[model samples]
Target chain A: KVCACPKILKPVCGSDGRTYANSCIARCNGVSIKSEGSCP
Target chain B: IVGGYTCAANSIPYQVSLNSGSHFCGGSLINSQWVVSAAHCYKSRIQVRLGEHNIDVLEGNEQFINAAKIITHPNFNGNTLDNDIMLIKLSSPATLXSRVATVSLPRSCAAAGTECLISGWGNTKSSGSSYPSLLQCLKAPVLSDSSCKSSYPGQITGNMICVGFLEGGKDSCQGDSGGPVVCNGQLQGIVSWGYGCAQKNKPGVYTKVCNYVNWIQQTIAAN
Candidate 1:
């Protein structure tokens, strides 16, 4: 909420199991980063 | 801007202009701190301007905010242009005013023949001429998927919707990408790409907003 993120095309799956644009965006969306790449 | 009239000043309150330096795309303010646009409109140094009417004038009501983050849909394919939705996080929350408000997202897909209003600052001429300064508005209708898919055969997918007349003349152009396609006061579609700005039998293609309603709500609610 207080910080900004980048535009890199790295994707990460969230704790909620949805894929976010990236880890930073995933964090901004309040979802914990579950792992790198997409969720299976 | 093709075959459309200029709407009353700030009449479409949720209409916002996306700018890198100047207006290149149109978008809808879906909430105070969020905007919905085409993922293709994304750039590193983008800004969202709310309460904007004439892009060239100093509309005192304008609220200019840099993007905090831009979340392009994870499934977005730049090549195919499928799943083209994008979310913008403003650097700061917008202060809503009479000329600035949020448009409600659609709850479900619009049926065939449904009328919708689309607004933008894209080129007015179908031949790549005269992009508008004041926002332009057009009344378009949802075309049956069979009708639309027939034109581009094998290209139209569930993630896409087509609006406008088959006879041509009215459409959202190059600069209009990411603008709102509101039906029944709900944002049902987004201006994406099209076949050369409303040519005959080529109704403008849009990103189907109905398919992404849940994704939008979850993304905004969590962020």
Candidate 2:
């Protein structure tokens, strides 16, 4: 279900406490989206 | 200049031409005393000309100011173009007016797909011989970092942003370096580099302004 969504990479944080290119990338890596920007 | 329109006089008030004897790069007035531009534009005797539309003509609205000092980012890497931003402290504060004002810095990074505008006196074509006499402005969309990364491979760092069309037709060229990439009325990026102008899949790359806000504010405050 997780893929590099279309073409909107707005850095996001994943539930796994890592920064991702976007939510899709996070999900693709088996992680869930947590926030809109980079992780703290 | 390539695929761009001549901007109205003083339409982009904050726009300035960084002159190293001749027009070398474009810059933006960040405040009364500070200007933001690309570090690679650095030259020993640089001058800042504000409220100027045409580089060749000395319109009465122009303000020729001496650069008091130039501060390139400490981490600036000439090879990688990382931290390619720089600030110029003007010898005298700019007299803000309708034709000369500062552009607001972005509070956060611009999201991908955001349509942004870039202005400069860069060459009209990738292989053009002449630079534009007047300022040229073009609209380009911010591409996803992933897509940009795909194009640049290991070259697209978090400190850089990519903006242009995937098919490629419009972009800032050689002389456009150090220009502004304004989005949502806020300054977002500074023209840094690219593979080539308007080349397919090779969009213009810029130094992400949002990533340097803290450094900017601190540098200005300390200096």
Candidate 3:
């Protein structure tokens, strides 16, 4: 199943220490975002 | 099957038929080798059929696989229907194709009043009927936990969700247990049980899939 990602490009950092395009991308990857910006 | 229509073949490929010598319950394929279902559906010698559209006719899209392992939740309470979830490991991984696919798990918890889809080969009514040869699909709206609790009294739990209508006429009935409740294209719940199937003020109860996402992942990884 292809995870539906929002078209918006608001970036977020996931708990897996990877940056996602947005919350939806992180969630679709089975992880939650840890921060609002790219991983430090 | 009551108040539902025959779903198009392979439309919901993730749907699974758990057969214990006969059609027992419904389930969903979450991955190539893992299936999620209701704990109470557990039985010895259970086998799973995927890409099935009709139970009576053996369509060319069907894949019959043995269950390599069955893991029921340690805290599942059969009486109250709490934590009513289970995992079945397929003896061989499914071949993903247009006719076979996995369902996406909920990214977040589902809210009350969300519209969802339910499908299975269960009985057409609450009583006096056999399983449907073709899969049945219905649209159900999620009921608030508060409303659900009031209907079932102390039986409702945090690990369960309720969906359907207070006016009755549509619901998952006998043989529908362990079926998928897909909301927003993600699996949100599993058909668990209900009081007499679509009774007035009695919505269909389900095992909340979001509540067990971590456990599901961990169990699949460890096994």
* DockQ for each model: 0.02, 0.02, 0.01
RMSD of 3: 18.2
Q: Candidate 2: which pairs clash?
A: B2-B124
TM-score quality measure for candidate 3: 0.83
**How many collisions per candidate?**
0, 1, 0
Each model's TM-score? 0.84, 0.83, 0.83
Residue by residue across B72-94, what tens digits does model 2's lDDT show? 99999876878989999999999
What local lDDT score does residue B208 receive in model 3, on the 0 to 100 scale?
90
| After superposition, candidate 1 runs with Cα above 4 Å error | A1-40
Query: What's the lDDT for all of these models?
Result: 0.83, 0.82, 0.82
Candidate 3: where is the Cα deviation over 4 Å?
A1-40
How do all the candidates rank in terms of lDDT, highest first? Answer: 1, 2, 3
User: Residue-wise lDDT of candidate 3 within A1-40, one digit each (tens)?
Assistant: 1132212234579888987644655786788889987699
lDDT of 1 by residue, B152-217 (tens): 788887899889999989987767888999999999999887666768888888999999989998
Cα-based lDDT at residue B123, candidate 1: 73
Order by TM-score, highest first: 1, 2, 3
lDDT (10s digit) by residue, model 3, range B97-145: 9778999998899999999999998768643444578999999999998
